[PDB]
Structures are given as structure tokens and as C-alpha cells.
Swiss-Prot record, chains A, B:
Catalytic activity, as annotated: an organic molecule + reduced [NADPH--hemoprotein reductase] + O2 = an alcohol + oxidized [NADPH--hemoprotein reductase] + H2O + H(+); 17beta-estradiol + reduced [NADPH--hemoprotein reductase] + O2 = 2-hydroxy-17beta-estradiol + oxidized [NADPH--hemoprotein reductase] + H2O + H(+); 17beta-estradiol + reduced [NADPH--hemoprotein reductase] + O2 = 4-hydroxy-17beta-estradiol + oxidized [NADPH--hemoprotein reductase] + H2O + H(+); 17beta-estradiol + reduced [NADPH--hemoprotein reductase] + O2 = 16alpha,17beta-estriol + oxidized [NADPH--hemoprotein reductase] + H2O + H(+)
Tissue-by-tissue expression: Expressed in prostate and liver. According to some authors, it is not expressed in brain. According to others, weak levels of expression are measured in some brain locations. Also expressed in epithelium of the small intestine and large intestine, bile duct, nasal mucosa, kidney, adrenal cortex, epithelium of the gastric mucosa with intestinal metaplasia, gallbladder, intercalated ducts of the pancreas, chief cells of the parathyroid and the corpus luteum of the ovary (at protein level).
Name of the featured protein: Cytochrome P450 3A4
Superkingdom of the organism of origin: Eukaryota
């Protein structure tokens, strides 16, 4: 059971002492981040622990992080850690490995250029307006509002229209087929009973594969897989060139093997999976900060109105202008980096920056811990957007602050996500103010589980500026 | 169950139609070779079948074989197929993979040069003489003799002295610790109940790994592992530079990481495993041919006496002189290539000689089938050493005849095995003649199992030329 539990004392690396079979996992009872902050305090700049028998080497030196994330990414640190029986989703770009990942990343990169994002702004923006109508009635009847649902509704609407050109009011059609299935594509909690069992019985993943058991619900994937083959074959026979689905079909008509029909479906799914709950999550987090910091919220309302007088519609170019807006988004992602950790598997035996790392270790960068480290962040607990002001932004290490990771395997959806969220916040603050309620959790607490989500759902009062 | 059972009809490759879950394995009831000869007849030059869910692509074109075995060996076709829970023997060179194999092959290659083989001739040759004394009494009492045991005894004696400098008469000490354990290192029958179960439940290999269950008996490996660490640490404090163990310890004192103490032990074991039963097997096969072809046996006796008049001792240089001897050994290996198949896993998607081979297929070369194909071999069923005469040897394709495989991953022990066997045959035929018995199986039949061994053990009369 302790087959590899002696690796780190042989390399001279400090770490919590593992129990047989379980390794160190019992320390996840306070969750990944508190586990990581404490390891960082106690042991310093580098340390090791075991997810069961899997060695994991944490690193916090910005120079070493750059080597892993960008420098020898293609040679050594190309893939993330496996996490469960994925079925055909093995071909999704976030899951794919090595050379099929390089092929997939090269084939999907043009889809995320600012040119294609700029053509999608009018569609996203339309659901800014749907968000106001849905929120205008939730404020006109002064009931406290549950951000997650009003923002979930919004993220969903952006997802469906931006990926498949299906234009629905999900809040007012929670019965529609497309919103019924995507609502069940929730982020994975790697500390829940199932995924923890996997960590302690990783030898069970092939068994589950052979029974067609999949961490992606076997029925939503089927619905989308037929919906896509329905969309295509129909789409064939107009506007087009509007959504992701369309940009992907058109790349199947160009030195890399064009996406297969099934590779295509896999990417459509992973984009929905990445964007839906994450986007609503951060949007909830941003408003909680703006409600508990109404000076910040007001300074943002003023910047919105200066750029967009008369509740003028936001555009691509006006979004990129708004500097306080950018500052607020980044500072909310500092305190709540939805990822918590970045990881790569060490493909070979390598020495980086003076440290032998053996094959098969997963190297982990603990983003949440670095975003809250005193050694880089004055008053790290405080929501303080001025740290990203054009005056101070230059004294922040891009390898300490990595809300989207770094290097060739960074978030491919960063520009989109950033714009998507910004367009929401503008149209919302153009029409509304957000005040705390008796029911609001202040200060907010993070869950002890595996997702970076609030303990209790964020609820706030919302009054019409009108 | 039929997840991948449609791969070959998509590529247009012909093959027997697989059953769900089992693939094609029920056709192994007549064994690998008869399965392969029939596939070769029916489907031609290329075909596919499934060991359970594992696709296997057979190839018989000599040009394509060269690409796989030598040309793109390092890039694409570097590793053999996994076959069971191997524990620490994962570090043995025949099992090791990719870059650790390249390192291990480079670190062990000097150990098998003709210079080191030439220093080992006097030790091997000594057990030529032990073989005569043991056989002289088995013939002086005209009891039919069981080749496998008299040759097993011999192979064992060569193994122990050549690898560890332990000099025993195993036939006359079948109670000694070293002969008790190595006698249990028998070749694997991949058609036996266990290894067939593995093929149909390959998802069970990790499970067995985690229980420390190993196809290498957990106790013989331990005995040798302590024996080696005993040998060393003792060996330290004279002659030395005699056996494999010694050449390996000395390479631990030189751009490749010198063998670890455990890597070393693993290689000692695999050499014993490769050499012991195989050497006795072919030696049994050669004598069966010489008994059923006493003209051939006589022509060989005459060549031995011409080179070595007066029963003169064989030496390295005299062995390499003996051309009929070489011819007999090669022709016995044509009819009984102990390997049956050569295999490599296809690491990437590749096109070789006009054929797309997808990642993960194991490419198989069916040696037994090629050694008996009429299209290259006139009278292929007949034991006819003249096909390797200096007159006809040049019309034999080295990729059809591959008793040791070909390319950088060929048998590293070929020169040794060839000399080892030749030294046995000289001293034996110098003193003895081998005649059939009523009890001898004529014609010999091969087993329907997974090892290329005779149905019933070869038994023959042996008379002293003295
Ligand atoms: C607030 C919004 C988002 C955040 C903070 C975020 C963050 C991240 C992070 C931290 C990673 C790992 C980066 C690394 O390993 O170096 C990642 C990867 C990825 N993200 Fe996002 N993401 C967001 C939204 C999106 C959206 C809207 C998409 C839509 C397609 C998306 C698609 C992906 C993909 C496909 C990957 C894997 C890239 C690869 O392996 O090549 N993300 N993201
Ligand atoms: C009649 C005697 C022998 C025969 C016919 C034989 C045949 C073979 C064959 C057919 C292969 C596979 C080659 C390939 O995949 O291309 C092989 C590999 C190998 N043989 Fe032998 N062998 C014999 C004796 C020995 C002996 C005495 C040793 C002693 C060390 C040995 C060690 C090995 C090793 C280590 C490999 C794997 C090489 C690698 O993967 O780098 N063999 N042998
Ligand atoms: C799950 C997925 C696809 C992922 O690759 C991921 C997310 C955070 C950290 N590491 C990997 C993701 C999820 C949400 C936003 N972006 C990406
Ligand atoms: C089992 C082992 C080590 C092996 O690598 C092998 C043998 C025949 C075909 N393919 C691989 C072997 C066994 C006997 C002689 N040589 C090598």
C-alpha cells in the first residue's frame, strides 16, 4: 500500500507523512486550499504529498512555474492528471493528451481569436437585455434575489446561442429540452464520495470504462451528440458563421487531420462544461464583492456611464476600454480562482531549476495559495481592486497570478469568458444597484468541498436605478 | 464489449469476425501458429484480429516488416505488448519501455559483445565436459534418455556459472538452493487459463499489481534479489570479470544513469528467464532432427572431427568455423522459432508503405507462419539444412527468417545463445550418437498451447562412440 510512499524522503523533499493506502487525503477534510495554504506555511517553497499512491510535487517558485507551464510544456509537462472514466470525452481538448492535444489545440485555436470573439459580441449582448427583463421583475417585487440562478440563467442563454445558435429564455423556459440537459453539466467535485474513491482505487478506472460508466452523464452527452448531428445536416441549408458549432464545421473544410464528427461533438460539450457554471460562479462572486464594497460598485457605475452615457449599449471596443471594470474582474478572480490548482504530469525524468523530478509525479501549482500569500500580496484577504490599477499592475508576477493558467495549455476560453462576463456586468450595473440583505453571509465562507463555491448561496437586494 | 470491434472493417482490412468481449480468442484452441498459418492462407499478406478488445494487425510483407522492426522502431514501434502484472520486473529490458528501454539497452549492450562472449567460452565449455559425464552414465546403462532434463541440467549449469559464478552439477545436486529456484523460472504460456483471463480482462492487471501479484513468482525473485546483494558486498573482496553479474557491477562505475541496484537484479533475472528453458528447448529440438536424419548427424560428426581431431576441445574460433553446424542450428530454428510471433505496439498514428495504422494497435509479425510459407520455402515441412549452405544462404530474406527478431530491439542474447548451444552440440556428438526409440514420437507434434514445445517430451537412445 505504501509502495511509493517513500519517494519524497529519498529526494529530500519535506511533506506531511502519508498513511498507508490513503496517502494524505484525510487532510482534504478542510479542502484543497486550506490544505495548500498550510503546506505552504509549514514546508515553504516546495513540498510533496500523495493522493493515495500518486506522488504530487507542489511548487511555488515563479521561475520553476514558468519552466513547467511554458518552457518545457511540450517536452515534459504536456498533460493534466487523469481523473475518472471519460469514455469518448477522452477526445475533448482539456482531457486529450500529448500529440492529439497538440493537434486539437491547433485546430481549435482559430475559433478563439479576437476576430471571432468580436463577431459574437452582438449575440451575447442580446442576452444582456434578457438579463435585465428577468431581473427587472425580480427587483420590481422587492424579493431578495439568488444570484446563482439569475446568473445561471444568463450563462446558459449565452452558452446555447453562442455554441449552437439556439436562442431561448432559459429562466422562462426551464422546461425546454436544451436547458434541461445542460443544467445537469455541473463542475466536478473531486472531494465528493465518488471521485475520492477513485483517488484511492485508481485501479478501478479501467473497470468503470469497460462498463461504459462515465463522469459525463451518459444521457446528456447522447442528447447533445444527436442534437449536433441534427443541427448539422440541417444547418446544411444562410446566416451561419455565427456560433462555435459553425466555426468547427467550417474547419472540417480547410496539416492536421480535420476534426472528426465525434471529436467535434466532444469539443462542443467541453465548452458548455467549462463555461456554464464557472461563468455564473465568478459573476456571483463579483456582485458579492460589489455589494459589500458599495464605493467600488459606485465607482464602477460611474465609469460605465462615462463610457456609455444614456445606458448606451456596450460594444467590444467599449468593454476593452473600461479599466476599473477590468480591475474589479481581476481582483475577484484573485480571491476566487475557480481552478484552485494547476497541474501537469511529469512525462520523463527531468531536472528543472536545480531539482530532480522523477517520471510520473504530477507537478502542482497551488493558485489559491499563491493568490493569498502575504509574501506577494499586501492585505491579501481584502477585496482591493487598486492592485490592478495601471499604476501597480506592473508589480504582479504572472506566474503568481494565473486565474487562467499560463503557457500553451492555458485556458483557451479566456478572452471569451472575460468579455462574456464584462458584458453582463455593464448592462446589469447600468440598470441596477446591489445591496446586502439580512440573509447575506458576511463575511462569505468557502466550502470545504472540492469546488471553489460559497458555503451558502449568495443572496442580495437589488433596486432599480430607474 | 464490441467497443473497438469495428476498427478493421473501417480501415478495409480483412479478418476473422470477432465475438463480443472475447474477440477472436476461441481460435487459439489450435494455438498461435496454426491460427496464423490459416489467417495467412485465407486473408493473404495483411489481416486483423482482436485479443479481446485489443486490435492486432498481422503483417507479412518483408518491406513493411523492416519499417516496423528497424526503420521507425525508435519513433513508433518501440515497445512490446504488456502481458501481466510484472511488479519490479517492469525494469527488465525485455519489458521496459521507450526511453528507459533505450537507456537500459545502451547500458547492457557492451555486456553482449563478442569480446565478453569470448572470455566466457572456457566457463561454458567446462560444462560441456560435465554434460558428457552425466550422459556417459545414462548411455552406459542403455536406458532411453529424456533430452529436456539432460539439456535442462546443462542449460542450468551454464546459466548459474555464466551469470553468477556459482559452479554446480545441477543434475547431481537437484537439492541445491540455486537450482531449486531457477528450475521454477519457466517460460510463460500465454494460452493458459490465467494469461487468457488477463487478455479478456486486461482491466484486471492494475488490480493484480496493487495486490503484489506477479507473473514472476514472488519468492524466486526475492531469493535471487538477496543472493545478488549477497554476491555483491561479498564479491567485493580477485578473479572477477568472469560473469554477467560482474560486468553489470562494473558498469555501475563508468551519459546514462548507471544501473540501480534493483535495475541490476532485474536484468540478472530476465537473462536466466530468457536462457534457461529456451536453450534446453532448441537443443532438444536439434537432437530430434539429428536422430530422425542420421545422415545429417553423421555429416556433422565428420565436420566436428575434421575441425577437432582427437575429440579436441572446442574453442570460440573453432565454433565459428563449423559451417554445417551453423546450418543445422539455423534450420532447426526455422522449423521451431521459439518465439512464434514478434510484436510491437504502434505508439502514434502512422502510414507505412501505403497503410494507415492507428495508434494503439499492436503490429504482429508471425514468424512461425513465415518460416513455413511455401512462397519462400521449398519443402517447408522438411528438415533440410542445405537451405543455409554458403551456396543458397543468400536467397533468404532476413525479414522472413527472424529466429531472433530484427532491429534495435532484437534478441540481445543471440551471439551467446548461439555459442552456448554450439559448444554443447560439439562435445556431445564428439562422444555420442543419438538413435530413435520405439518410444520416440515420429513425426513430432507441436502442442496446441502457447509455448512452442513438443506434444510429448523427446526421448531417444544414445550410444557411446567409445
Ligand atoms: C471565468 C471563466 C474561466 C476561467 C477562470 C477559466 C480558467 C481556466 C484554467 C485555470 C484552466 C487551466 C489552465 C492551465 O492548465 O494552465 C483552463 C483551461 C481551459 N479552459 Fe477555461 N476558464 C474559464 C472559462 C472558460 C470558457 C468560457 C471556456 C469556453 C470554451 C473555457 C475553456 C477552457 C479549456 C478548453 C481549457 C483547457 C485548455 C487545454 O487543455 O488546451 N474556459 N481554464
Ligand atoms: C535459442 C536461444 C534464443 C532465441 C531463439 C531468442 C530469441 C529472441 C527473440 C525472438 C526475441 C524478440 C526479438 C524482437 O522482438 O525483435 C528476443 C529478445 C530478447 N532475448 Fe532472446 N533468444 C534466445 C536466447 C536468449 C538468451 C540466452 C538471452 C540471455 C540474455 C536472451 C535475451 C533476450 C532479451 C533480453 C531480449 C529482449 C531484448 C530487448 O527488448 O531489448 N535471449 N530473443
Ligand atoms: C474542467 C476544465 C475543462 C479544465 O480543463 C480545468 C479547469 C481548472 C483547472 N484545470 C483544468 C475547465 C472548467 C472551467 C473553466 N475552464 C476549464
Ligand atoms: C521472454 C523474452 C525475454 C522475450 O523478450 C521474447 C521472447 C520471444 C519473443 N518476444 C519476446 C525471451 C525469452 C527467451 C529468449 N529470449 C527472450
Amino acid at each position: 500500500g505504501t509502495h511509493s510512499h517513500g519517494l519524497f524522503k529519498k529526494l529530500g523533499i519535506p511533506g506531511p507523512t502519508p498513511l498507508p493506502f490513503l496517502g494524505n487525503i484525510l487532510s482534504y477534510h478542510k479542502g484543497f486550499c486550506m490544505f495548500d495554504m498550510e503546506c505552504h506555511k509549514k514546508y515553504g517553497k516546495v513540498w510533496g504529498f500523495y493522493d493515495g499512491q500518486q506522488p504530487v510535487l507542489a511548487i511555488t517558485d515563479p521561475d520553476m512555474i514558468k519552466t513547467v507551464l511554458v518552457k518545457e510544456c511540450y517536452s515534459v509537462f504536456t498533460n493534466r492528471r487523469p481523473f475518472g472514466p471519460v469514455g469518448f470525452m477522452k477526445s475533448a481538448i482539456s482531457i486529450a493528451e500529448d500529440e492529439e492535444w497538440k493537434r486539437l489545440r491547433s485546430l481549435l485555436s482559430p475559433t478563439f481569436t479576437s476576430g471571432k470573439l468580436k463577431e459574437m459580441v452582438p449575440i451575447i449582448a442580446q442576452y444582456g437585455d434578457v438579463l435585465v427583463r428577468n431581473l427587472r421583475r425580480e427587483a420590481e417585487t422587492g424579493k431578495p434575489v439568488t444570484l446563482k440562478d439569475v446568473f445561471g440563467a444568463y450563462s446558459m442563454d449565452v452558452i446555447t446561442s453562442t455554441s449552437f445558435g439556439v436562442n431561448i429564455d432559459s429562466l422562462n423556459n426551464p422546461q425546454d429540452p436544451f436547458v434541461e440537459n445542460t443544467k445537469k453539466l455541473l463542475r466536478f467535485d473531486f472531494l465528493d464520495p465518488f471521485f475520492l474513491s477513485i483517488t484511492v482505487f485508481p485501479f478501478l478506472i479501467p473497470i468503470l470504462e469497460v462498463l461504459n460508466i462515465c463522469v459525463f452523464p451518459r444521457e446528456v452527452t447522447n442528447f447533445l451528440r444527436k442534437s449536433v448531428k441534427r443541427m448539422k445536416e440541417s444547418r446544411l441549408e444562410q446566416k451561419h458563421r455565427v456560433d462555435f458549432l459553425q466555426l468547427m464545421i467550417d474547419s472540417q473544410n480547410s496539416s492536421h487531420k480535420a476534426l472528426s464528427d465525434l471529436e467535434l461533438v466532444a469539443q462542443s460539450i467541453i465548452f458548455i462544461f467549462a463555461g456554464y457554471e464557472t461563468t455564473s460562479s465568478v459573476l456571483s462572486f463579483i456582485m458579492y464583492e460589489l455589494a459589500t464594497h458599495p464605493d467600488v460598485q459606485q465607482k464602477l457605475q460611474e465609469e460605465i456611464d462615462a463610457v456609455l452615457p444614456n445606458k448606451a449599449p456596450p460594444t467590444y471596443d467599449t468593454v476593452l476600454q473600461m479599466e476599473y471594470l477590468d480591475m474589479v474582474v481581476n481582483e475577484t478572480l484573485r480571491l476566487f480562482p475557480i481552478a484552485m490548482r494547476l497541474e501537469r504530469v511529469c512525462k520523463k525524468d527531468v531536472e528543472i531549476n536545480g531539482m530532480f523530478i522523477p517520471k510520473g509525479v504530477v507537478v502542482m501549482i497551488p493558485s489559491y495559495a499563491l493568490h493569498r500569500d502575504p509574501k506577494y500580496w499586501t492585505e491579501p484577504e481584502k477585496f482591493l481592486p487598486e492592485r490592478f490599477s495601471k499604476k501597480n499592475k506592473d508589480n504582479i508576477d504572472p506566474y503568481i497570478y494565473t486565474p487562467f493558467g499560463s503557457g500553451p495549455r492555458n485556458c483557451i476560453g479566456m478572452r471569451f469568458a472575460l468579455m462574456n462576463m464584462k458584458l453582463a456586468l455593464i448592462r446589469v450595473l447600468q440598470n441596477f444597484s446591489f445591496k446586502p440583505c439580512k440573509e447575506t453571509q458576511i463575511p462569505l465562507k468557502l466550502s470545504l468541498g472540492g469546488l471553489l463555491q460559497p458555503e451558502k448561496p449568495v443572496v442580495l437586494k437589488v433596486e432599480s436605478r430607474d
